[PDB]
Structures are given as structure tokens and as C-alpha cells.
A paper describes a structure:
The engagement of a DNA glycosylase with a damaged DNA base marks the initiation of base excision repair. Here, we report cryo-electron microscopy structures of nucleosomes bearing a deoxyinosine (DI) in various geometric positions and structures of them in complex with the DNA glycosylase AAG. The apo nucleosome structures show that the presence of a DI alone perturbs nucleosomal DNA globally, leading to a general weakening of the interface between DNA and the histone core and greater flexibility for the exit/entry of the nucleosomal DNA. Mechanistically, local distortion augmentation, translation/rotational register shift and partial opening of the nucleosome are employed by AAG to cope with substrate sites in fully exposed, occluded and completely buried positions, respectively.
Cryo-EM analysis of the AAG–NCP–30I sample obtained high-resolution structures of the NCP in both AAG-bound and -unbound states, at resolutions of 2.9 Å and 2.8 Å, respectively. In contrast, the map of the AAG-bound NCP (AAG–NCP–30AP) was identified as a post-catalytic state. The ribose ring of the –30 position is in a flipped-out orientation, and there is no density for hypoxanthine base at –30, indicating that this is a post-catalytic AP site. In general, AAG attaches to the minor groove of the nucleosomal DNA at SHL-3 and is angled at ~70° against the plane parallel to the nucleosomal disc. The distance between AAG and the closest histone is beyond 17 Å, and no interactions between AAG and octameric histone core were observed. The inserted β-hairpin loop is composed of IIYGMY (residues 160–165), which makes extensive contacts with the skewed DNA and serves as the damage-recognition motif. The flipped AP site is stabilized through three sets of interactions and the interacting residues of AAG are highly conserved. In the AAG–NCP–30AP, the engagement of AAG further distorts the nucleosomal DNA. In general, binding of AAG led to further outward displacement of the DNA around SHL-3, and this distortion was local compared to the global perturbation caused by DI in the NCP–30I. Due to the high solution accessibility of the –30 position, additional local DNA distortion induced by AAG alone is sufficient to deform nucleosomal DNA and allow AAG engagement to the damaged site.
Author numbering:
A (entry chain A): 38 to 134
B (entry chain E): 39 to 135
C (entry chain B): 19 to 102
D (entry chain F): 23 to 102
E (entry chain K): 82 to 199, 208 to 248, 255 to 295
F (entry chain G): 11 to 118
G (entry chain C): 10 to 118
H (entry chain H): 32 to 121
Amino acid sequence: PHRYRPGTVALREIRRYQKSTELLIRKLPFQRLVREIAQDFKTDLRFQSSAVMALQEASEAYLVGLFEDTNLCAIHAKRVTIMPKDIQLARRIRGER
Amino acid sequence: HRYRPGTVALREIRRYQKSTELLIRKLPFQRLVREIAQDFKTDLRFQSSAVMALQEASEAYLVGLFEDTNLCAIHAKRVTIMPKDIQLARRIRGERA
Amino acid sequence: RKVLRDNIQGITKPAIRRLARRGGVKRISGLIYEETRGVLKVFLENVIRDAVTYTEHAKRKTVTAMDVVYALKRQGRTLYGFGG
Amino acid sequence: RDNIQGITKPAIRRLARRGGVKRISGLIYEETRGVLKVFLENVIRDAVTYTEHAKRKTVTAMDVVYALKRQGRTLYGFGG
Amino acid sequence: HLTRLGLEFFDQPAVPLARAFLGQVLVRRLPNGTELRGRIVETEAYLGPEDEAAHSRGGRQTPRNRGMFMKPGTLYVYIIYGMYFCMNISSQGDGACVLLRALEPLEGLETMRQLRSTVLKDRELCSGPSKLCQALAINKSFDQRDLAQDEAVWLERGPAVVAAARVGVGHAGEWARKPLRFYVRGSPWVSVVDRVAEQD
Amino acid sequence: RAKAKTRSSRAGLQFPVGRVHRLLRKGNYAERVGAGAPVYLAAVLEYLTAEILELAGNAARDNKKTRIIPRHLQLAVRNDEELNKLLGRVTIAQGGVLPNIQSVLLPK
Amino acid sequence: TRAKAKTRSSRAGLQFPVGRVHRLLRKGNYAERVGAGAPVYLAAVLEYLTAEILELAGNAARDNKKTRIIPRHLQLAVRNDEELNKLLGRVTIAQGGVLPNIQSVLLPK
Amino acid sequence: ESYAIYVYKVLKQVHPDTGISSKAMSIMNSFVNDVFERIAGEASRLAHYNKRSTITSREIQTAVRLLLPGELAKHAVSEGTKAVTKYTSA
Amino acid sequence: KESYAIYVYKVLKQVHPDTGISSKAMSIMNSFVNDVFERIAGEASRLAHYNKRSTITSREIQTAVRLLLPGELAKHAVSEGTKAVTKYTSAK
DNA sequence: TGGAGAATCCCGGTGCCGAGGCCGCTCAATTGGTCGTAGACAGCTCTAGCACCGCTTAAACGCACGTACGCGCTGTCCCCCGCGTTTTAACCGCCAAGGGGACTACTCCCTAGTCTCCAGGCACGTGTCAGA
DNA sequence: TCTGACACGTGCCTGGAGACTAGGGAGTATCCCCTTGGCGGTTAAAACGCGGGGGACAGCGCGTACGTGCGTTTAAGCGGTGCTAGAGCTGTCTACGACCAATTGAGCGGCCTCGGCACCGGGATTCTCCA
């Protein structure tokens, strides 16, 4: 049949998901994660829809920026594959612990 | 005799991480500060404490940048720092577009 | 009502792949996903803790959008579009 | 004129030794001089703005401290 | 006419005016010329100074609560929670008063349904003190008039009684647990019910 | 009296001078607020709004869209150097990112 | 006629000037009104933070066998504690120095 | 209270055939509020440094030079001084 | 010029009695006290402006301490502030 | 190098949902006047910043040697991409319950304002003890 | 073993504390929209398996570029003198901004309408890989 070489569909996904404006994580699992994180701080807590939407937008933008820095750390080490040490280096240089 | 290449560097690392003295000479840094400030406003007086504060800030910034540069150089399986390490460490913190 | 446990697995592996595709990543290792889940959990704890603090200062039970916006502007991550 | 060459190669080597650097390239020094020039340009420009707001011809340590505080580089020990 | 009550009935203490003000039809005359014929089902009693939940606790003589201490049976509308109102009426002596809580109508429900709106079932049309204030076109201007004069609202004589605990005052103090809310047994139109206090 | 002229009308501005004066007075910034400060700040705000909106309109025209969506504002901010420097710690909601694929990832 | 002038820091059991914190809060354009317990609370928080810094700095000075707190001791005190390093991450201490840290790949085998 | 009609007026002054969406207007409202908060806080801090209890056009002018980058600062100073000169002469 | 030097003397002699201090160390501690004071006061001002309150009270300072200070530091600072406020309001 | 097949772009039609204009009103901006007071402006002091010379000596610079390290090439084998099938639960719609928040009078305590006064805190002389 | 920077004691001064009042800011006082929980069909998407290919990674040679050492230069650094811009404070006076009363008009909520754009479908045009 037909089969694409490894990396063509990845570049197509890069173009497709950099052209779009959507939120990439599914809404209900992120909402449930927000509930289970907030239940460790104060019980019987309610959330508006816009608060969960704001948390999702901020977290997705933070993860996209972290993945850009992670990709540049991978390119610096003569690699095209991102690894946990890349994320650790990016967070260490940014000052996050 | 002749020492091995690297042990005098380690001795310098050990002896320059204990002292709190200022590593750039005072008069060249003062001349650099006046040369930079000549572009902004003409005939500026400078307090001595202003030049000392600028020297402390510049030395701290360069030492933190060299720490991030060393992390980038170690990340790429090296011990010799290169300008691409400086450029990566400044781009991750946001100092370079 | 009940207790919620192990909801970090809802941040699926294709979701992390799609967020890395937007970040320009061509090839992703298999150990990336757990680190990304931990990073997201740390970030969400740091933002939701400040949002809960802003909510408890106002003596309310509901977390508004402005509480999250103030909790993000607290951390130098100002968000435009949810009021301000 | 010049005055960036006064930040000499042993000074940059000493700063790298304080940072923990074991071996340094020969192209590090010009890049470090450029980065130091950019940082000093930003802080000195903000300090001159604070000085010329106060109608003074003298840059004080207060102006440098406030210029550093604006960039997120808060410096204790000089009256901040 | 003969179907109007006088001032002789209102010379009662706090708890009998809580008890003997049941089954009397509260009829309000709004200026369209129509009647309501609404009979109340439950009341509440505030003793005044010794009652910790009353508005006149410890000899309070605020100028808002001024239509109480000149004669028994003086009507008193008081504003609550911004827009809402409540129906207090004084008893014999200073401080003692009874509050109107809930009523059921036999006719005129269409006019009260129309006037209720600024989802509209008969069970929740006037099940509440602010609900009956908003269903009777009662404003803050009714404080200056009594119960038994001229052409405004009055009461009509009609043809078991269960005492429930206080709900909405909090679990604090000493006078917040006395049974003073008397309501009719078996009625499904009661706003605040007590399934454990019905067995005496 | 005379005809009531808005301070924005005599300052040649569309942004409100009076609202900026009220927000400076009620913002607990200083004990006193001068007369020229709301005029000056309304001019600065109008200039920055015009600079973002011009590039956002150009980005909407390049996408064959009459209306301005958040993506056009993101492309306006992150393509200008000075606006991206001013808004470097700002996330625009429903804005996405710039299309940027690295050279070493593209095939040869 | 007037009673004994008892300071507010003695009423609060504190050592920082509650009156100076109140005056600095009133003139700092933070709010139109400033409550009574806010300078007491803020002076207590500042005194606790000063006490923690001086504990760790005196411990660092005693470890270096000298009886005087120098800025190197304050830098060691701040950076050797995780929470004080988190609070003072964007802070440069003058005459402060750095921690002795050599990575494992730089040390000889 | 929002800056919606003023942003729409500026948009029709700049791009007369281009509209806007509700989310974009919310973002522009947030941008105007953020820049206002930045410049007003900088001017308050500048007045607190120089022992002044007033905020004048000079305070906002040096606050704009502190906050905005180069060409943005120069042009924002240009229309700010133009607006102050037009306000004082009319 | 007013400063916090004698109070740093008092705290240091309370907790490290046979230990002196330098002048640059006092400048650093004075700048540290000023920085933390400005941080907590600005956070309390923001908390008052968000809730449409014109008064800064002990609750806003407590919430500012919870927002700014890290975990165990925040818990102990809230404990010390609550102890000081209860001792101040108890004694008249 | 040509050609098959998948993906992507272009064009035409449809419908809906929200931007955009109109209108009444009401709340906040404008106008006019008054009243203190912050700050502009001139002046004087004297502080500290700049300009310059000598010297001595630690640091910087140029050069030689060489060995450690960056870097290009090579082999391998592990891990991840691409794709197909199967299974899970996310998304949508509807509905009911119940706590939680809008919401505005009221009324009371608390905090600004002001006078007085006095003691804590700041500037300055003294010896004195830790660190080079 | 010296010496200079910090601890200690004294005098004045100014701002913080006691005390009283005014008024305004904040706490408190049922009901209805908002959020949450559940049911249920639908299907979009996650999950698992498997082949294979290509990239991470270890090994190796080599060639050169920094490290280190040493002689020579050079200008930082310290001391000292001299001088004048300019910070810093004070006094005076007046322009300017807070504050308030009356007026009025522009912005905001409510309402209604039609066009921009998302979507669907078919066909033309890249575009990627393999014999």
C-alpha cells in the first residue's frame, strides 16, 4: 500500500497545530484535574466555566513555550528527540524548581 | 614541574567561589560606564556608589549567565563553553528574541 | 461529594504530543509524558493555590475567572481575555 | 572611545571560574563583552531616565538601585 | 360592614398571638377593585428584649422599628435583603410581636401570578414571607397604617397545630431553639417543614 | 453657561480624559493628580491601541477576513519587535503561536 | 493627667516599630484607611523574617569561626535555605559571593 | 465600564472597513487596563521617590520612557506632548 | 534618615547574643525589611482594591503573607502575626 | 526520472448567530467659583566629584609547548513513528436539587483628624576588641 | 601584633501615644439563578499491536586550540593637592488642584436586523514516495 516516512506526518501535525487556535487538551479531564488539585486546598469548592477555561489556556500556553525551549535544548545537544533532561534544563535555566 | 591541564582551573574555581571580592578592575569598568552613559546624556556626574552598584550587578549577572552557560555546555556533552551555550541560556530566560 | 484520585492520567499521551507539535517538536521520547504531567501538576498547584487564597479572602466558595487572572498576574503570566 | 577592551580576558576568565567553568573558548570573550554592554546599556539608560526626571546632573546609587529593581534585579546593600 | 375586626382582638401576649392568629384569611385591597381571599397557615413569635434573635433585643429603640410601641396590633413592614419585605405586627407590651410566614389562596391567583414577576406554580407562588409581601403589592409605605382601619388589608374570621424548631437563626445563643413556629398538620404547601417534630 | 466640550474633544483624542482622571484619582496612586496627566496618558493609550489595531487589521486582511479575531492580535504582537518586547509576559487567549519550524527539523 | 506612655510594640510583645509601620502604611498610598491590627501583624511578620535570617546568618558565621555577620554569611543564609532562596530568588546581595559548586563531570576521576 | 467604544472609534479611524469580535475587544480592554496600570504605578513610584504628592505630565512622560521600548516610547511621547500642547492651547 | 538598624540589633541580641554585625550587613537587612514591607503592603493594597475595600486590615496582611511567603515560612509568619494581634487586642 | 495516491487549496451555495446600529435615560463628566497649599524659583552653603601627578607593583600581555578535548566518521540496535483495529469515555442534550451569592437599607464600631507632651530614636564623642 | 570599625554613653527633638470626637465603611439581614450530579445514546478519539527504519549512542582517530608557565610591560591603585559644579536645604509666594453645587449629554443596557464566516461537497493543484 502507501506509507509515509517517519517525520512527514509529524511535520504535517506541526503545521496543522501551529496554524490553529484550539485548546488541545480535552476539557473534562482537565476540569477533573483542577477539581482534584483544588480539593487538597479547600473542600466543597466550586468553579466557574471561565476559571477552568482560563486555567486551561494558561497551562497550554505554558506547556507550548516549555516545549519550544525543550526543542531548542534538544537541537543544542545534536538531537531531534526531546528527553526529560531537556525539560529539566529548560526549567533550571528559567528558574523553575 | 608542569601541572596537568585542568587542576589549576579547579583550584581557581575553588578559590574564586569562596571570596567576595570584585573581579573586574574599578577604573576600566568606570570608563565603560561613562562611555555608555555618554550616549544617553552629556556631562553626567557619577557617584562612586553608583559605579560600585553597577559593578556588583554586572558581576552577579555575568556569574549567573556563566552558570547557565556551564549547564548548557555540560548538557551538550562538553566541558568547554562556547558562544552557542551563552545564546541558548539567554534565549531560554527571554533576554534574546 | 466524593474524593477524586488519579486524574493526571486524563492528560493523555496524544494530548502531550499535540502540545509538543504546537511547540515545534518533531520526535518525542516515551519518558516525556510523565515529566510533562508532573510539570503541569506543579504549575496547576501553584496557580490554583493562589486562586483559592484570593477566593478565601473574598469569603466565597466559587473560584471566578478574575481570581485565576490575578493568580497568574501574581506569577508574571498575565492573561488577556477573561476580564481585567 | 573603545573602553569595552578594559573588561579584559583574565577578568572574564575569573568570572567564569566563579561561575564554575572549567574550560573557556576564545570566542567567549567578545560575546561576554557584548552581553555586558547590552545589560549596562539597559541599566544605565533607566538610571539616566531616573536622574533626568529629578532634574539632576549626577547619577546616584538610588537611581541605579531603582533601575535594577525595574528589571527584576533587586540589589541590597546600597540603600534600596 | 360587619366583616371587619376591631382593636379588641390585638390585646394579646406574644405566644397566644402566635397561636390564635391561625386560619384567619388575610385580605388585601389593591386599587383595581379585586380581592385575594388568602388564608395563612403559619406564624412566628418574637418576644423582643429577652429574645436574642429579635430586632429589639436589649431595649433597642431604632427609628426604623418605631411602629410597635404605641398600641398593640400595629402593622410593621420591614425591608430585608435589599428588595424583600416582611410582615411583623406588635403585641401587648413593648417588644412582643408576631411575624407572618406563609399563606395559601383560594382565588385571585392569576393577579398574584401577574404581579409576582418583575416556574410560577401554586405551591411556590406565596410560600414565604417575602413571597407573600411581593404577592400582595406591599411596599415600605404600609408602616404608617395599622391593621384595623379604613380600606387597606385586614383579616377575616375563618371556620392539628404542630410547633417546629427555629430554622434560619443559627445554632447559637439560648433563645434560638424554642418552638414558636406553629403550622398546620398534613399541609403539603408548607415552606419550611419538620418531619421529626410532627410526632410530638 | 457655555457649550459643554469634552476634554478629549479639546485634546484631540478619542480616549476619555475624564475616565482616566477618575481612575487615577480613585486608584490610590498619589494624593493629587495634575491636569495634563490624564491627557498625556490618554494620548499614550490611544497611540498603543492604534498601533496594535493597525497591525491586527493588516493580519486580518492577509487572512481574507474582515473581522479581527484573537489570532490576528497575537500575530500582530509577536511579529513586531517592540510590541512583543512590551507584551513578552502576556498570554493572548485563543491566540496560538507563530508558525516556526526549525531548520534542522525540515528534511534536506 | 495623661497616663504612662506605653508603646504599641510592648503591647504586641514585638521588637519592630508598630508606630513606624503604621506611619509608613499611611503615607505609602496603599489604601484610604489603615486598620489597627495591620501594623502589628506586619511588624510581627517582618520580625519573624529578620529573626530567621539572623539565625541562619549567625550559624553560618559560627561555622566559619568568626563572631561578626558579614554579607557572605547573609548570602549563605539565604541560599542554603530553600524557602528563603525562593523568597529572594531575584535578589543580589552586595559583597555576597556564590556557593562552592563543582559539577561531577568537571571533577577529576 | 469598558474601553470598547473608544477602541472601536480608533479602529474605524485606522481601518475603516475592519470590524472586531467580542473576544478581541475583551483582549484590547485588558491591554488598555494593563498599560494604564503599568504607567500609573510607575508614575506613583516616581512621585514617591522624588517626594512629590502629585502626578503630572512629566511623571507620565518618564514612566512611558521607562516602560515602553525605544520607538514606541519616542512616538508615545510625541502624541502625548502634542495632546498636552493642544489641550493647554484650547 | 530613619532605618531599622536598632531593631536588627534587638532581634540579633535576642537570638545570637555573642554575635556582632557589620555595617554592610545592616544595609542589606534594612533593604530586606524595606523590600518585604513594600511587597506585603502592595499585595494588601491589591487585595483591598479587588474587593472594593478602602481599609487595609490584618486579614489583608495575612492573605498577602500567604500569597508571598513560601509554605512553612508563611505558616510560621501567620502564627507570629496572629499571636501579636491577639496579644495586642487582649491588653488595653 | 515519471506516475499513483493522499493531502491541500479553491470555488459555490447555505444558514445561523453574533456584531453593529438605534434609542431612552441616568449617572458621571463638565463648568464655574473658592480655598489652602504643594511646589516653582531664587539663593546660599559646602559636599563630594573631577582633574592631575607620582610610584610601586600586581596584574595583564605576548609567546612557546603539548596535551586534553571537540568533532567528524562508523556501526548497531533500541525506541518511536505510522498505520489499522478495538475499546473507552468525552461531548452533547435534558433535567432536577440545593447551596451560594446578588442586593440594598441600617446601624454601630472604628479609624481619620487634632492638641498636647514627652520619651524613644538619631547624631556624635569614646575607648576597645576582633581580624588581618 | 596594630588598627579601624563597631559597641557604648549623652544630648536634644520630633514624632508617636493618650484622649476626645465625627462620620462613614463594613457587617448583617430570603430567594432565585448557577453550579453540580446523574442518565443516556453517539461517535470521536484514545489505546494497543506490530513492523521497520532511522536516530541515539558508544567507540575511535586526529588535529588543533586552550591551559599553563615565564619574561616583560603597563597601567590599576593608593596617596595627595586643588578646585568648582552642583546636591541639598531654606524662605517666599502664587498658580494649581481638591472640593462642591448645578447642569446636561454621552455612554450603557435593551432590542432588533442582516451579513460574515464556518461548514459541506466536488474538483483542480501540490507533494511525497517508490519502481
